[PDB]
Design a protein around this ligand. Structure first.
Ligand SMILES: [Zn+2]
Ligand SMILES: [Zn+2]
Ligand SMILES: [Zn+2]
Ligand SMILES: [Zn+2]
Ligand SMILES: [Zn+2]
Ligand SMILES: [Zn+2]
Ligand SMILES: [Zn+2]
Ligand SMILES: [Zn+2]
Lengths: 485, 485, 485, 485
């Protein structure tokens, strides 16, 4: 078995908080209630003065992705260990299928690479980077048989991943047909391409060139465009890594307007800003380069946190895609060659608690919502995860909201040799992490093996996502006016 | 006992829906799960093809209020029966304390009148219609000992209930001190007073004069003003009967801005509009007169439903305050003498389901949120009510979302002899109502006695309301700059 | 000569109004002042009780355009006569160059067709419907030698006129280089194409299908996209025929944000709405079909007038492109074959005065601004036109704001056999029209010959348009951060 | 006479710019045109490479006001000299009538003090700081006989100037009756009073306490409230010293909504921000104290400039009300005793040109609009001032837009011994100032005598202000529905 009894703490779910013990057996929470009995042999974790919360679910990772030709240094093994140490018990990673390549083969390739290495549970989104009868069939197979209800499309990366409006329309339509959610990288790829070419010709080769060639308008525009196409075919839409105030306002307006869309800010865009691209030290500046870029407006992260609190934005990931200082350096003479991506998987939970809860922007319950419950709802395994209740998976974190910890590349568990949150003092510390009913992290120490985590197979037509979509198919059909010829 | 087993239906809570039976014993839900056993003697309600939902909680009623000198015809007895027949299992009624009168005496007077008559559970808000050391003391007593954490203040009704900005400030401050929520009637009382006087001098004595003398700008202005004062003292605010698009946009903006404020649209403003004040038939027009008025912009109710779906607005009441056709007629020659108030207590649930869920604006779960769960959170008895789960009160409705019913004063259970929703065909029918663990309504028939309902005593410092408030008291203190003299 | 003295009236310019006579000689206003002398032989027009205003300038016409294969019935001859009778003294018509066809040849072809026929002054925009070194050269020639500083690009009409984002970028850049303004037809051509295909498959072949396949979101999206691309290259942008509230709000927001963009609502979208597409009578419905379509939201025209008054929108045209009832009928079985376009050239001035000035939305001076002065500023001949002052062209209208006239296809001077403003009673009547210093219209009668009007040759780099653009090229250059390697 | 010929420069009016000489005789511009003849004895000012512009009109000054009991150090004599040296040729100063004091006596008192001292033209607004039959009569006398069409009301300064909503309503109504414009100090006086009391009790006595006790929400709220009351009585409204983004957004929204309201940002709020209140040096911080306060959001001045460019805000003043470092010091121990007010009269023109025109936010023509033309329109003497044209007053400035000057209390002409724009380098220098047809400022030297300026007597019912108001009285009357009893 391994039986665990978490005693003395306060359970925090999305809807409310209450004092209770949590009894874990065989991978599951089998009971929640006051003063539970300790069965002989069960380990007691003492949660007196702690919050007992669902482990974090990182909706957005790229572990060991080969990109910009090189591969991210946090791999499935180290990345998941780092997640665990930061209070995160599941990651959802993106299968980056290449143009013309089979989606199934790319899927197979990701499972073979991750299955023997994950230390926590995980699941996969699949990128749709080209279109054809074959892609259409493979998307159906993926949604019905391979446990994947999320497909990722790119409006940027011209020549590489980009799809045009007419292909987005076709792809979005077929997502709706197989009951998947459509995820979008929302930047105008034509403007990025022209922007970068122009920055280079002006001799602006540094990281400030990366942000200047694709300011937030270029994100906001594609965000609106994606919502418009999706709304036209009644397909549910998910906007990954919202980085800017204007793009977040597009999503906030579309939702007030009843559009079925979700916005996902990330740790990076909630915890720091793009003024770093202007840093005198090239290496420092290049640490922050990712697409879309962090924004030079200092009010951005606080504004994004306010919208996250208010549910204009709904859940969080990290877009963790790390490259060491010596890999970033591939672009020392040309910012278009800096491999894009920052850290976050480990620090997301503390970063959000410090910037969101300690600051008085959201309460502990909205915190649980935006770090696990909503991910589980949208990707279709709630309340299996994202909730502390009988029958749920025992992915649980004992959380100390009153103590602080400073984030540093010197004490973090990620492979990358720097940290975009370097120096930040955060209230909220994961003191014990439980994953699949086992104590994988306690007293600063990890105790877990590569392969201990499991792939989570999901069904299509997530209810949280589809109930309005289906009712609209029923009563929102356009009608003819009846006329003599 | 009276044991009941609700079998075969689909439970709908705020967060998700799932197939399960519900076992009720002695006033409580004692078990929720698949295929429960029928203990000998328990009555089985067959919920096959039905939704099993928390009974509705009407946040806003005025049963048998003596006003405009006369009294509303739906009293505590008939009003609660009508609630039950419409799927609503609790009402929160307002103690309308007069100027200079003790709040405790008015409280006592309301309990004595309602206790022997309610057929469903209820609770009370208390209006603070004047200010002084005595009112200050009585508010504390009410919050700590009389089960009341909501106080109602008026920006309209000059000479009668109105408080000025400096008194709102003092009152709002003391609400925060005793852990109450501040509710506001948000209209500019000076503009109403001048507006009405002007409409009369122009010979516009009909109901169109009532709306024209206080168009929605006059509501939006006071709504902003109330949020500003409340935000200044860090007091949580609740805006009752939001009737207009502009006033709802004020609340939507304040919340995106992190203000602690809740907006409460009502059945009336979600189900019909103010074009009715322009009806040729005087009696018809006067049916709709209430303050603030319904709006002549036909897009209003749909817009309010969109904001309710998106959580710019958060919960619903009815402001049920009814006067028969012959009482309305007191103002046949002068609209200022029409006793203000419309129906809704009975029809709220069906009205919202038809306009909100059937239309594809919100799903069944957000429906539960906005008809019971949020009321229970804000007024501080969740999940005791507002949720189908073990240990919760057995206030449950078996709901048929596929069948329609037409609303008519000929078939409704309210005392009033007309209905502002006359003729409306609504999907969503309450087929069985259970209150306090007893079947009080089934097959169109009510089975309940005056006095069967209970007053619900609440504690102050509702967590849903106060957790952000208290964290802001801790880290939002303004700080001095340290200076040589 | 032909000398004219306009005596006794009140001159209305964009900035103010004042009593004065206007002395016209040889095509020009040669004096403006109180009580001028009548030189022997000069004709006196008595303007007592009238406004004396600059003649209207219609920024947007398609006289006798061969399209959807057929040609509009108002040709240069009749269209300009109709303009004159409605108080409009200049039109700007679009050279609809076909894909792969020389822009110069299309220009030549338009001048040859219009020069011998116009009864009032005119000028031309040229559509850029494809891209290449040749188009690039011809645009320069057009701007420097052929009197054209406005180029028109299409985001709709896939396969026919449409340009993609990367071509818009290149085209917009070169517009800025030759000092032209970029005009855009802002609708997403991919969504229109898919929308229409879908409406047809659903058997919705009527005009309601035309609007439903491209609702206002599809306009708003392309409008934002165009502003974003234009802003990226610092190119001034002009959005033709704004038809919807949401697309007008995009332009209003971009301008508050300092973007150099102008929005042009038209008579149609200021004077009627798209509820007409739902008319039982097919012929009636099809009268209103144009791209983008009129909108079924009845508050649209009033809202557009409010933004026009407030300068969120800046000037007006008509998009006059008329087809007789028997030509519309080409699409009786399929709305995609209804030749697109409505009337307006003649009625624009009265329509705007009734809906804008009589209604109290704008004053007579803003009226002059939005019917002539702004057109002259943007297209680069102010104050040569658009102002009543010494040395300006004598294109003048004597305007009666107090009398009304009803618009009817029975009394209008347009070739088309119906009128989208049929029945409208408008305050504001053009009693005398003067064009090029000659009385071409008086007492309901026209007195003018085809060819009497002149092509107006303009220079590039309009100051109204370019002064901010050029200052931004000077101080808005992105700068490198100076770094050790 | 004194004849002057300004030769060789470029005339910049509100609508366009063009090369011409300007011939001045006897106080008036008597001719504008190319290459004018120099009559024997006329002085030639060589304006080669310069802009020739209408002199600035400062809509908002308090010269030598006795306040907070002490009097401002820039008096009518020095203040107007300083204006002249900064390119400003007229000021409009406020008669600060005390509570219970006759408005006529206060008017008389201001004219007697200013008439013998002004060096440039001026006019007066009159504050209405109490209400009664007498105030009502005196307002009529002022508007019809004393040349004053602007009355100033206070929503702040409780106990001192403040009027409540019902008095604002009555006052605003009577302004509309006498054809005046209503000006408002828009802050909630109750919140200020409570805010200050609270800051003091918390030991925050420094200038940061002044801003913290009345953050921008408190301005935005009163701004909305004033617009709402004014709109209710159809009275035109003018919001003085808009200091914040949120209050400017209230005015921007009300105007898009067709409300007759004008917003007036000032030099202070366009040129610096409230972060200065947090300065370690007490004397420095207190320099910036005025009501409402400058805002600690650094994006404020740029945002206000963007709205000024876009005409969400329409014209500028300075609220010049200066107190020397040793007078400010009256509040060294309590910020409520710092005499409120900053400098600006002299620097407004250069500040706006640097921040507005050089930055590429507005062009030179919009600059003229917002520094003179709009003031003249609203207060009812355009084009007598605010325009370079025949018959206009010769108040003219020769402006060098390419040269910069640094602003410093060491080189400024104001009496006050510091400058809130200290150190700012501004493009745009007034090289020659002409007032009433005389060269009063050239080569850094002033040549003018106290009393040389004249009071400008205005008429009521300014057309720019009233034409929409009057049309709305005609067609916006509310109508009765016709009904059998
Ligand atoms: Zn991405
Ligand atoms: Zn990513
Ligand atoms: Zn009320
Ligand atoms: Zn009420
Ligand atoms: Zn077009
Ligand atoms: Zn067109
Ligand atoms: Zn003031
Ligand atoms: Zn002032």
């Amino acid at each position: 078995a391994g039986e665990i009894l978490i005693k003395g703490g306060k359970v925090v779910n999305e809807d409310c908080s209450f004092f209770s013990d949590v009894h874990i057996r065989g991978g599951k929470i089998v009971e929640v209630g006051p003063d539970l009995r300790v069965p002989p042999g069960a380990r007691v974790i003492d949660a007196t003065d702690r919050l007992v919360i669902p482990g974090g679910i990182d909706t957005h990772t790229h572990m060991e992705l080969a990109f910009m030709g090189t591969r991210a240094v946090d791999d499935f093994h180290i990345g998941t260990k780092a997640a665990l140490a930061g209070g995160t018990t599941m990651i959802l990673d993106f299968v980056m299928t290449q143009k013309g390549q089979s989606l199934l083969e790319a899927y197979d390739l990701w499972r073979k690479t991750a299955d023997p290495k994950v230390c926590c549970d995980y699941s996969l989104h699949v990128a749709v980077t080209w279109w054809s009868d074959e892609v259409k069939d493979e998307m159906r197979t993926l949604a019905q048989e391979r446990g994947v209800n999320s497909f990722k499309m790119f409006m940027a990366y011209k020549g590489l991943f980009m799809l045009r409006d007419d292909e987005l329309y076709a792809v979005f339509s077929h997502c709706k047909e197989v009951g998947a959610i459509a995820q979008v990288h929302a930047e105008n790829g034509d403007l990025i391409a022209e922007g970068a070419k122009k920055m280079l010709s002006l001799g602006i080769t540094g990281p400030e060139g990366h942000e200047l060639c694709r300011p937030e308008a270029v994100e906001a525009e594609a965000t609106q465009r994606a919502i418009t196409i999706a709304s036209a075919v009644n397909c549910p839409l998910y906007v990954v890594h919202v980085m800017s105030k204007s793009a977040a306002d597009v999503v906030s307006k579309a939702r007030k307007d009843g559009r079925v869309v979700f916005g996902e800010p990330i740790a990076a865009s909630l915890g720091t800003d793009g003024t770093n691209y202007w840093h005198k030290d090239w290496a420092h500046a290049a640490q922050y380069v990712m697409g879309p870029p962090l924004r030079p407006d200092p009010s951005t992260p606080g504004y994004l946190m306010d919208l996250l609190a208010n549910d204009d934005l709904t859940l969080t990931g990290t877009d963790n895609c790390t490259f060491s200082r010596c890999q970033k350096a591939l672009g020392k003479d040309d910012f278009t060659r800096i491999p894009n991506g920052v850290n976050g998987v480990e620090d997301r939970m503390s970063v959000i608690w410090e910037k969101g809860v300690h600051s008085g922007k959201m309460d502990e319950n909205r915190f649980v919502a935006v770090t696990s419950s909503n991910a589980a709802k949208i990707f279709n395994f709630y309340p299996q995860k994202g909730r502390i209740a009988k029958d749920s998976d025992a992915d649980v974190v004992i959380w100390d909201p009153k103590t602080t910890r400073k984030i540093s590349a010197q004490t973090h568990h990620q492979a990358v040799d720097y940290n975009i949150f370097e120096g930040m003092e955060c209230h909220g510390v994961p003191v014990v992490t439980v994953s699949r009913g086992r104590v994988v992290y306690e007293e600063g120490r990890l105790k877990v093996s590569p392969g201990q985590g499991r792939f989570i197979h999901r069904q299509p037509f997530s209810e949280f996502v589809y109930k309005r979509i289906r009712q609209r198919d029923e009563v929102g059909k356009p009608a003819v006016v009846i006329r003599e010829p």
